[PDB]
Design a protein around this ligand. Sequence first.
Ligand code: PEF
Ligand code: 8PE
Ligand code: PX4
Ligand code: PX4
Ligand code: HEM
Ligand code: HEM
Ligand code: PQU
Ligand code: 6PE
Ligand code: 6PE
Ligand code: CL
Lengths: 377, 61, 49, 49, 75, 48, 105, 49, 49
Amino acid sequence: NIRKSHPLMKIVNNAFIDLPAPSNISSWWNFGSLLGICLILQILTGLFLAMHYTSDTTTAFSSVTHICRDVNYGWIIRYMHANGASMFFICLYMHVGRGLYYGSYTFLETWNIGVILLLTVMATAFMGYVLPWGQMSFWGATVITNLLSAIPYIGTNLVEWIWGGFSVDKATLTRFFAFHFILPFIIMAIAMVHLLFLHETGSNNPTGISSDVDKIPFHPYYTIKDILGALLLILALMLLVLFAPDLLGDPDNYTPANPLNTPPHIKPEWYFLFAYAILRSIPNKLGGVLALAFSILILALIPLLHTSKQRSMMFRPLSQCLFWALVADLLTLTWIGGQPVEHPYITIGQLASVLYFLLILVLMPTAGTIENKLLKW
Amino acid sequence: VAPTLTARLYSLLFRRTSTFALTIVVGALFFERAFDQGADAIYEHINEGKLWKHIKHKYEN
Amino acid sequence: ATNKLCQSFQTFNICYADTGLLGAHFVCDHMSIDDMMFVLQGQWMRLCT
Amino acid sequence: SHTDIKVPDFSDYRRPEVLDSTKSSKESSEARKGFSYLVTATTTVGVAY
Amino acid sequence: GRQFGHLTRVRHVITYSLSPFEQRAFPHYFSKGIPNVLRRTRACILRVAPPFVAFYLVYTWGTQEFEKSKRKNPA
Amino acid sequence: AEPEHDHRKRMGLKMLLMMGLLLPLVYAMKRHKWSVLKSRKLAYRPPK
Amino acid sequence: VSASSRWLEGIRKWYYNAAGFNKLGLMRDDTIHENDDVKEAIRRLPENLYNDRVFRIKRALDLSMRQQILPKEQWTKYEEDKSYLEPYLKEVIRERKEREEWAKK
Amino acid sequence: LTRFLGPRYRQLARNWVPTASLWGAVGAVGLVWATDWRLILDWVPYING
Amino acid sequence: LTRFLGPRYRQLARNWVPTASLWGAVGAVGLVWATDWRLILDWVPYING
Ligand SMILES: CCCCCCCCCCCCCCCC(=O)OC[C@H](COP(=O)(O)OCCN)OC(=O)CCCCCCCCCCCCCCC
Ligand SMILES: CCCCCCCCCCCCCCCCCC(=O)OC[C@H](COP(=O)(O)OCCN)OC(=O)CCCCCCCCCCCCC
Ligand SMILES: CCCCCCCCCCCCCC(=O)OC[C@H](COP(=O)(O)OCC[N+](C)(C)C)OC(=O)CCCCCCCCCCCCC
Ligand SMILES: CCCCCCCCCCCCCC(=O)OC[C@H](COP(=O)(O)OCC[N+](C)(C)C)OC(=O)CCCCCCCCCCCCC
Ligand code: HEM
Ligand code: HEM
Ligand SMILES: C[C@@]1(c2ccc(Oc3ccccc3)nc2)OC(=O)N(Nc2ccccc2)C1=O
Ligand SMILES: CCCCCC(=O)OC[C@H](COP(=O)([O-])OCCN)OC(=O)CCCCC
Ligand SMILES: CCCCCC(=O)OC[C@H](COP(=O)([O-])OCCN)OC(=O)CCCCC
Ligand SMILES: [Cl-]
């Protein structure tokens, strides 16, 4: 009873112990806590990397090597932080894909707060990749920051204002380090408002049917299920860190930055390849930059495109096929994103980009309406 | 050993939480010594020639 | 009594041949079952220890 | 009519010791707890290391 | 945040539960689990698989085509 | 380029062995608690 | 009217079994998404239909937890699926549209 | 705060002194183990390595 | 979302169009003022300095 009355523990009790939760939430509901585990992992590893990092352009590259060579277990902390960022995006896309399949977006405040969390984590990881100051770090900063130049009539001012100069330089790296430090703490705060709005309604479940008739307490059922999932997250992370720490990185990033020469085979991190592919399928400068932004911001429109009288796709075969056509289409854009801009990849990437927006805007809402008519309602 | 092994472990060590914790902290102590000892002996057997401590005899001084 | 956790409770020790039911039974409002269970078990553990 | 209620058979779920209706559960009370609490203690040891 | 005792209305439903120290944690793990995996796979294979099969064929063709185009042809 | 090579491989071996222990034990703790629910039986007896 | 009607109904029965909510003992109206119109219609259900709706959903969630389905004998037959909620929901919608039409003048 | 000086309170302390003694062994062994305290561990038989 | 098309809703919009027009002047002047927008401020008489 003292868990319930103390002003501080009552918040913990009503969120992790006595919280009524559905009895049937699958493994796809584990990624919520794993996103928090990832956020806490990145803060700890990242904080210990800032104790031995310098944001000077002339020593930023060398300070990272100093970590991986001379700092006691500095390398393992370093590669946990890098691979932890990739694990962060694995969990994000599964968390999002879970909500799309099972209709969890109908929690508008929770969903929309979610879209904000996705964008800030994207901004955080982009700036993080600029810090080691390799070749891909510099030219990654060059390409993505120049996207603002597409904004008419103020673009170059926004770009040069952000750069602190006429190009990416020492002033740009020092501030990206300050942003990369602080932005995770804002994310943690926004993640609490994410959970605040969620608890108003409680969780959805795989059936999309209300579960108030069958609820179980979060403890001990989902404390131990979340503990098991965390051990599997650590397994996935430590396999990368301890057996393949460079598999997800680019070798050119181990050469210091050089503003005078760009590598020929630009390849971003795997978690940006699908959207990189969308942008270059449009040769117009402003058009391709808007398509990039809309490929992510379209998530805010998914609640308005829900046509089915059922919430979850568990009982919607036609929507299921279109859902998996979107995953395979996103897998195609990721593949095209990792290949050079040449025949036939240019045309494949154009067709996949059209299919991506065609599925979300046209096909999937029409499938939900066909399904309603098939059930005669 | 007429009583079950797991049965005698429970009555003596697991019934009280205090002795249930003492068996864990004492177990982690003896587990750490034996696990690192056996793990290192396996990593060294696969790599018997390759390691430095397998070549330190050449360089006496 | 002070917190109005129940309308009644009773402890019992029902005996049979070589077995029995040792425990308690209570009657309460639907928002008080958890507190009665908590206080009940706390007293069992308190007397054990 | 509430006396028409019988608890269903759990025989295809019960542990081996507790399947005999004519045998006390006190017999295997000691062993069953130790088996499950042994698994917990080992897990803490691995986490501890 | 909602709380137990205020969720919804339920009548005439009986639930029988067994203590976890009284039953197996892995009852018929393979003798019953493997048949259930096959049932669930069959029920969803036609919804999930054809999209990724379509990706695999487009992936291999696009890579094969890109390789042949980079090789020169006699004048 | 990778002086930590040998030490990382030794750690990788220890990580695999501990996971091979902890994964089935933690899995067993999950099923132990959940068994209360997985074997629960329901019956509906409305008045007529 | 058997020729063209039964082919449409044949495709609906195909989809009904493909949807698979009958495999958990559910009926169509048990799966509808609860918006404000649906909460009111459920509120208006008589005692027996409400209690039946509760137990079927409870039985399906229990199955979904165990990743199981009912035996094939106990599946909800397409011809026996009763749209017990539709008439209440139709009235609730008709009442809301009346309010909205009065709110326009 | 003199109210805790009485026969009941000294019977209560006597019931909990075996438990608190053991939680001191948990913390002592836990501190020695977590810090690799050479001053104490040189005396343990098998640990010496 | 057709329910907002009616005589009352178009009387309501007509009552609030003078207010929304003025809040556009507040934001427009506020944007020009906060950014020192030379494109517009060159035309204002006394501001020219
Ligand atoms: C202030 C502290 C902040 C800590 C924040 C950490 C964040 C959590 C990161 C999770 C890392 C997973 C374990 C890395 C193992 C390693 O790397 O250890 C390498 C060592 C060998 O090392 P050695 O060969 O030098 O011999 C050592 C000298 N005697 O054996 C291991 O593999 C042990 C790991 C076993 C497998 C992983 C099991 C995961 C359990 C989760 C426990 C997490 C604790 C949480 C702490 C906050
Ligand atoms: C954004 C950029 C992304 C770039 C990376 C793209 C790479 C993609 C690689 C493919 C990933 C495949 C993941 C594994 C999917 C397994 C699907 C499965 O197991 O079957 C379908 C399953 C059926 O389960 P039901 O809940 O319908 O009913 C169960 C009743 N027994 O139903 C489900 O379990 C569906 C649950 C939702 C799956 C989430 C996958 C989402 C993939 C990312 C989406 C990104 C959206 C932006
Ligand atoms: C100076 C240094 C001091 C440190 C010294 C070392 C101390 C070691 C811990 C000793 C305390 C152990 C007490 C304990 O186990 O109780 C907590 C729970 C309950 O155990 P349980 O078996 O469920 O019931 C106990 C009943 N009993 C006592 C009568 C048998 O048992 C547990 O749940 C513990 C095991 C769960 C491990 C998972 C939780 C850790 C966080 C997750 C990390 C992995 C995922 C990232
Ligand atoms: C793109 C750029 C766009 C920016 C354009 C500039 C916009 C300028 C603001 C215009 C909005 C003014 C509206 C307003 O004043 O209302 C808010 C309150 C209420 O005023 P009040 O006189 O109390 O009652 C209003 C009644 N009325 C309208 C019938 C006369 O009035 C106030 O309280 C405002 C004055 C209080 C100032 C103190 C609060 C600021 C934070 C404290 C900073 C100093 C301490 C660190
Ligand atoms: C830092 C990033 C994020 C964290 C830490 C986080 C965390 C969580 C947690 C703990 C839950 C409850 C448990 C669960 O459902 O797994 C949850 C639920 C949810 N999240 Fe997030 N989330 C993040 C980002 C997002 C994003 C980007 C979206 C969507 C664009 C999103 C949408 C949702 C939805 C719809 C639910 C409710 C799911 C349900 O009830 O079935 N979240 N999130
Ligand atoms: C959501 C949280 C975070 C994410 C996703 C993230 C992601 C990343 C990524 C992808 C890199 C590039 C690593 C590389 O190329 O080697 C990086 C580097 C870095 N991060 Fe973070 N980070 C996060 C939080 C933090 C925090 C909180 C700190 C400090 C308190 C931090 C400090 C650093 C430092 C110093 C580096 C440069 C060293 C290096 O390149 O490894 N990060 N981060
Ligand atoms: C890590 C990374 C990044 C991080 C985050 C990030 O967000 C998003 C992820 C998904 C969708 C939208 C945004 N998008 C790139 O930052 C960086 O410079 N590159 N590579 C690079 C090289 C050349 C051009 C562009 C990018 C990355 O891949
Ligand atoms: C409160 C933080 C304590 C951390 C102190 C510390 O760094 O511990 C190092 C010593 C090492 O053991 P030693 O035999 O080398 O002895 C070397 C002596 N310098 O271990 C200890 O002595 C741990 C003592 C714990 C007391 C609270
Ligand atoms: C949304 C952030 C906008 C910030 C852009 C900016 O840096 O503003 C600079 C210009 C300066 O006015 P100008 O006459 O020099 O014109 C110089 C043109 N480069 O002021 C503006 O034009 C403000 C325009 C505001 C539109 C929202
Ligand atoms: Cl480097």
